[PDB]
Amino acid sequence: SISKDSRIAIIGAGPAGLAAGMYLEQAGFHDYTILERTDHVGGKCHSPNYHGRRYEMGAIMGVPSYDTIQEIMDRTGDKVDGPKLRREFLHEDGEIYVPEKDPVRGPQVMAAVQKLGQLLATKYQGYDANGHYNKVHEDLMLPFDEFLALNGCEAARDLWINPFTAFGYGHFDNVPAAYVLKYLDFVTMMSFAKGDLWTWADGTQAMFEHLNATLEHPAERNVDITRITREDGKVHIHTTDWDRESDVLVLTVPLEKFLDYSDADDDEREYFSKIIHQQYMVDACLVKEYPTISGYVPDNMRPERLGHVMVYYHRWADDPHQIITTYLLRNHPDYADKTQEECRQMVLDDMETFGHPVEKIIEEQTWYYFPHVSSEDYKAGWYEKVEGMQGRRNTFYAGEIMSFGNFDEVCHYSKDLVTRFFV
Numbered sequence: 273s274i275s276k277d278s279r280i281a282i283i284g285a286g287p288a289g290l291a292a293g294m295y296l297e298q299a300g301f302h303d304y305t306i307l308e309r310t311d312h313v314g315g316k317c318h319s320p321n322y323h324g325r326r327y328e329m330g331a332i333m334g335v336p337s338y339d340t341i342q343e344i345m346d347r348t349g350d351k352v353d354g355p356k357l358r359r360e361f362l363h364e365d366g367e368i369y370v371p372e373k374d375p376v377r378g379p380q381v382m383a384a385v386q387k388l389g390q391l392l393a394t395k396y397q398g399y400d401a402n403g404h405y406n407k408v409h410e411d412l413m414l415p416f417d418e419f420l421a422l423n424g425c426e427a428a429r430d431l432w433i434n435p436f437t438a439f440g441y442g443h444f445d446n447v448p449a450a451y452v453l454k455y456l457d458f459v460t461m462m463s464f465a466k467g468d469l470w471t472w473a474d475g476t477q478a479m480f481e482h483l484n485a486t487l488e489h490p491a492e493r494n495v496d497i498t499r500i501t502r503e504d505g506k507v508h509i510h511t512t513d514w515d516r517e518s519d520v521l522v523l524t525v526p527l528e529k530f531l532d533y534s535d536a537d538d539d540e541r542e543y544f545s546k547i548i549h550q551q552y553m554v555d556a557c558l559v560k561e562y563p564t565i566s567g568y569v570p571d572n573m574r575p576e577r578l579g580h581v582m583v584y585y586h587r588w589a590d591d592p593h594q595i596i597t598t599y600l601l602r603n604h605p606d607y608a609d610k611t612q613e614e615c616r617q618m619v620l621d622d623m624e625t626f627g628h629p630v631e632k633i634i635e636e637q638t639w640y641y642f643p644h645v646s647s648e649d650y651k652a653g654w655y656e657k658v659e660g661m662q663g664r665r666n667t668f669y670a671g672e673i674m675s676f677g678n679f680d681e682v683c684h685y686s687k688d689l690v691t692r693f694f695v
């Protein structure tokens with residue numbers, strides 16, 4: 273419903289921004305500009321170099337159901353060519369164990385997982401749609417454990433938790449079911465269970481670097497946007513080097529932060545102020561005693577264990593002097609934030625306990641991760657409001673908050689945005 277001569281400003285050159293550009297271009301919208309704050313593209317798909325190979329400070333993997341990412345690879349020529357993923361399970365004291373062989377718990381999990389699968393296919397059909405503009409069943413608005421409890425499927429959490437909480441998405445005691453099941457829909461959960469997982473030799477960042485290259489208008493980098501105002505039916509953007517006018521604004525950046533440099537209206541302030549995010553910290557480590565496999569720590573995914581390492585990534589199996597990244601969470605609604613100080617010490621103390629002591633941390637990042645809203649705010653209609661606001665003063669809303677904090681979900685949402693409002 274937008275004219276092709278519309279000047280479109282895309283904020284953010286992560287997967288969501290780059291995809292917005294790709295799919296606008298492909299629909300015949302050629303006057304777009306992507307504005308990126310940093311000197312690089314890919315956002316949280318971030319793959320730096322060390323000793324001739326790239327490691328992952330962010331996203332690592334996908335599943336075969338990453339249809340939109342497949343479309344992106346078709347465009348760039350990239351292939352799923354990374355090292356195969358495999359894992360073991362550790363207790364908080366470093367003891368290796370196999371949860372699948374628990375005689376009492378094992379059959380409980382498998383019963384719940386099967387019952388849930390059947391409920392998802394029928395009672396909750398539609399749960400798995402990208403975005404939240406299609407209003408989900410009320411049960412899905414509850415925290416994941418409450419959702420499970422209502423259906424007698426509590427034991428399902430043992431399977432679902434490992435690719436969720438450890439991957440920094442937070443805890444089932446509070447994170448609403450709708451987020452969990454849009455990412456870990458039954459097919460995706462199964463793909464994780466089987467280990468049918470994509471990785472990239474040159475990192476997840478590589479294909480978005482290449483996507484950028486294939487664009488008619490690659491991202492403008494190092495753009496320090498100080499002001500956006502939206503009067504007279506136009507979008508005026510002010511940076512450090514220039515101020516310029518566009519017709520349409522497309523946001524793939526943190527929307528609560530956008531409040532601080534925009535003429536945000538009453539609804540934007542009110543609703544974007546409700547956004548909560550995860551403080552997810554990655555440390556890239558040189559280790560003595562190199563693992564021979566990646567490790568998960570369900571024990572350390574309990575809220576009572578916030579700040580502890582929940583998982584570590586074994587990437588290059590052939591070189592014991594390569595990077596092993598560790599993952600912990602710094603926040604939870606029921607607790608005060610953990611300091612970077614105390615969490616870094618837990619990285620040292622946890623890895624030594626696991627038998628993989630750290631010689632060096634060469635890089636650390638706490639990421640702005642998984643923007644979402646509370647079960648109450650979800651129930652109160654958050655996305656009915658925000659999706660209802662779409663196109664208001666030529667501003668459109670996208671990125672992680674409108675879908676989910678994964679790179680297929682955001683790209684798929686960007687694709688559909690063009691379908692929903694532009695064509």
Ligand SMILES: Cc1cc2nc3c(=O)[nH]c(=O)nc-3n(C[C@H](O)[C@H](O)[C@H](O)COP(=O)(O)OP(=O)(O)OC[C@H]3O[C@@H](n4cnc5c(N)ncnc54)[C@H](O)[C@@H]3O)c2cc1C
Nearest residue numbers: 284286287288308309315316317330331333677678679682
């Ligand atoms: C440790 C880790 C593990 C992950 N694991 C997976 C996984 O297994 N599978 C998966 O699918 N995803 C995974 N992800 C999530 C995935 O990387 C993100 O969901 C994805 O990058 C989202 O893309 P986005 O563009 O929507 O936001 P982002 O990736 O955060 O990119 C946003 C962009 O906007 C820019 N920006 C922000 N503010 C401004 C400003 N005001 N002005 C201009 N530009 C701005 C940023 O610099 C950035 O480039 C992981 C991420 C991390 C950190």
Ligand code: NA
Nearest residue numbers: 372381431465
């Ligand atoms: Na299992």
Ligand code: NA
Nearest residue numbers: 400454455457
């Ligand atoms: Na999905």
